[model samples]
Target: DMILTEEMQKIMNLIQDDENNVFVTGKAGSGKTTFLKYLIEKSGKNCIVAAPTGIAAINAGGVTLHSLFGIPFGPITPYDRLENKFSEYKVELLLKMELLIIDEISMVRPDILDTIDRKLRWVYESDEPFGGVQVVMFGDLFQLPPVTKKQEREILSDFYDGFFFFNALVFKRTGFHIVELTKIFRQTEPEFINVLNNIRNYQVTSDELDLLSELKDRKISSSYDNEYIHICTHKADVEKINADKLGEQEIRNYDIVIKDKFPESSIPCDLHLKLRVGARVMSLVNDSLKGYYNGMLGIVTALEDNVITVRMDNGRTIKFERYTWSNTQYTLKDNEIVKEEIGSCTQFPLTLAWAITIHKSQGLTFDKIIIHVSHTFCPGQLYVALSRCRTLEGIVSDAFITKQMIIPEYALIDFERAYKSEGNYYGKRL
Candidate 1:
């Protein structure tokens, strides 16, 4: 219910009264999530929120663009009919929406965005952008690079080949109001934040890279306070590593089976989560009654018949029957997001942690991170892994930090073309 400061209030005002679509950009730890939530709470209008991926949508309390629009997973031809994929109620819901908010705009593939645009156009029978619905996009372009074709010519020869949502053909005429949020709420250290800024803006100094490389050879182990998680390159690798750690503890294995049939993709953790006594775990969802929340770190002190005792970071131990995460399907209820749960998935709701994949680590913050970069092939992989920490001092990577891992050429081009400055865009002239 609080805006935190005057700058956030100004942003809220802009979102409420702005005439054009808004493209909200911010750093890794910026209050973009808070801003979006506040806007939805205060708008009082029927707004539909969505994200590019399943996990992103789940975290946002919304549905994926594919699920909302019923667009197929792959290449969508102009002749394909996506509107028919929706039920009668879903179509009416979309048509009545006053605003459409899409988060994680960076991960949205150009092909998928184009398909969404075309589907909206066909469904609403309008030539306007997003079928004339006001749109707001939120994401950090530096976090993850959008999917691009192997050959530049192959993508450029088609629709919206650029690795961003704004590269769509409709934006050539109809542009959005781009706003870059500068206030960071996560990283408190000015020096550390400065280095992240340099890396994000593609202006990193050699000394800054050397400063990051300072953590190249630190021998560290996980303590209670400093539970360093390994950011792995692949999903299998992370799972294997976590199990190895659990096995090394020599604790009894506890398997929690999900009793409900829900969309497994929406839930954050694996379906068959294996845990052990003395394992460090994190809550995927908030349990306000028990004071557990997302990113609330805890330790398993006792394990018995479906009921486990978790000693929270504050040293308070609570035994709960089970933890649950919901597969939320958003719909308008009284002009706000209903967070309508079509089905609920309840399980241990804990992931065996000491490690997790960078892809799954989206939107989750950490106190300490150990970035393993040997198999990381993406240009922005290391940056995403490093940015998850509260400060640069809490970050250490096995690889020698280099500028090649930070600078994304396509993102730079998009920034130059779409962004004018803070709270502005090339759209003013367009």
Candidate 2:
């Protein structure tokens, strides 16, 4: 394994040695996922990893939090009980878990995590937060916010101060450590990094906005080495662009191969991936040995029943086979964490890349991007879309970015300022 940075190593010690509850966050390409996998392998603790959504759960090689806890899909109240909802196996696993890791925690609702906390407290009979379990979460809160409907919001307003996981009452009762990773691996230029950071923190100055505005009408020559993926604000816009592009070519359809019980919602890519000989596609899996990383853009050159050929942006041609994504359930057996693959789906790890929504591009990085988001409605939406590209030179914007587009949640900004100045509330000071 690659060595961890000093920042990452300290977080590791806090979780493994001191058993401190930690929240790990970093900018895009800060090696958050790598550090998590390393810590899990080396901790020697009976650990359970989960995420808020299906694609996230699959990426983390774990199960969805709702499924793990047998939570209902609707809103949960403070009066909810842990009894009769969990099986003996799940109860044993929760009771024995030394560490519980939640990835993509930015998308997790405050009530959901609070429910988990209450359930843990009940199962282990502990007054402490999370049943005295060392809870570690990973995600950049600036990347994506938790989703809530108007009705859900009205119901949750009574219980939570806000929708963020940090707003959960359990955290106010017992605070957790915040560790932010600073080193960025995607883009090396300090100027570019600063520009992205300005947008990320909602503190973009006129100079930085001008720098981005310079790309508003930028054009790439036909000979440009990389393809630009359009980042749209709405699903309708993305679908329209992708559909128009795909309709121009002779298309072929490939139905996904499913085994056992892979849920329709959990499938990462399109169930029926439509492609043309020259269709633009992006890899959904990372294959270092093959020189292709997830989010790397490519063009489809050939298609077969068992193999698909792609010419990656780096000028390398590779033939790919079906990649299988599995859904697993974890159990504590004989004092060890045993994971059983309950379902699997196999398909090409490629998706139509002519356009994609900003939400779907949360954790993925690209060398080139075309920002077509006319307006942004959510916090950090513009920042997430702009930061997906690797460099300023690689970005192409459809319109000038204005103050109206870079809306930041004031609560999150306040939390960040406090987190930076005061350090963690109830853990070892960084």
Candidate 3:
């Protein structure tokens, strides 16, 4: 019984009229987090949903824009200005926060939105910026884009391109609008949304060029054994195929197991092996790892050869470190390592088995997948890893479908002319 759309009721009547700072974007299960949880339960306002991870702020129950703007984790520190010195319990949580939303915002970071606009203009002393608060945001700048350490010409610029680069700042930004949510809510197949709109508009269709010549003859018949699931452009060929005998024959052909004990950033050579007691694992950390895991599947229920245990499917139980729980750190280059700088870690015994991430493998369906596309990734991570499965049949890969893994007619004509001038300045029409 969740309906909404008239562009989610014109973005909840442009944030119920004041519009404050909205941003919205959409795509990938278009009910933008159930229309920002029905605009925070029908605008009773006093909001604060934030997220820039921690599994999208615990799927929007909220909190974590660095604990709602106190900001302090590793690196990037410049926008100063936080002094509200909020104490009477953070000014009673921003005097009951009248709207702040945030969800993903393409993984934030424009120095974390200019240190959350100078800590919401020094905690609402309001000289206009965020002090007036209201900010909505949500995400999908072709999913996953702001992780700035700087210099790739200052991190490929465009942190919201100076808020809509010109034309009188898009006509003085008004109660700004940009609705987009184009149909296809999690693909209920129209031939898998026509090969995911021909790999997201690199334009194909002749039945996507006969399904890319029957997916290049079934990836050249599973490239002669290793029966598909390759895409490893070097993390030293994923640590030399997880160090031979294909990572000990995909862990002795997966049949649940677990084993733990190695944390303390896993000492010298605990050989990062976290998962052994009846292992069948999955949680590739989308955040929630101090226990109480969330999505990505699990199984290994107990083992002690270096401590292992896991149970996720709502029944909990965790403990981890079978070989420092799935190692990942590659970065060499030219002698090769760089499998997309493979660095975000946090592995343990969390579970919930179907697995995702290739930007949540856009528009879901996956009967099978294993693509790890990495030419230092991005064409929206090979159009969300070859449009999440459906034929390409139980697709797997070890790498080779090139043509520079398509999708770049100038970034699909700059995302269809900034989604048709933000759908005609938000009268809305995607």
Deviation (Å) of 215 in candidate 2 = 1.7
Instruction: Give Cα distance to truth, residue 30, candidate 3, Å.
Output: 22
lDDT of 3 by residue, 1-430 (tens): 6776687777777778664455677566567766777787788766667676554553344555775566775433342334445456554566457677777676664456666656666667666555666667777655435434545224324333422112111222233356766655534556665666566667665555555444544454344232233333334543444344223422422122323422233222212443334444554433344453223344666665455566654567666553222322212234322212112223343322223344443334344556654666555556666655645566655455564566553543464576466553431221
What candidate 1 gets wrong by more than 4 Å, as runs, is 77-85, 146-157, 221-226, 248-261, 312-321, 330-339, 375-377, 402-407, 413-418, 421-423, 426-430
Order candidates by TM-score, high to low.
2, 1, 3
Encode model 1's per-residue lDDT on 223-266: one tens digit a residue: 22357777777889777777776785545544444545466666
The candidate scoring highest on lDDT is 2
- Give me the candidate number with maximum TM-score: 2
Q: TM-score for every candidate vs. truth? A: 0.86, 0.94, 0.31
Which pairs in model 1 have colliding backbones? none
- The reply for model 2, stretches above 4 Å from the true place, is 17-19, 80-84, 218-226, 426-430
Candidate 3 lDDT at 240 equals: 45
lDDT for model 3, please. Answer: 0.50
* lDDT score for candidate 1 against the true structure: 0.69
lDDT of 2 by residue, 1-430 (tens): 4867998888877776544788999877889998889889888788889999988999889888988877678777787555546778778888878889999998898888888888888788888878888889999878767568889998988877788888887876677788888888755778888887677677788888788778775454222234778887789988887787788557889889899988777899779988888888889998888878888888999988888899988899989788999988887668688798888999999998888888888887787788875653567777778778878887888777677888777887878887777765433332
By lDDT, rank the candidates, best first.
2, 1, 3
lDDT of 3 at 415: 47
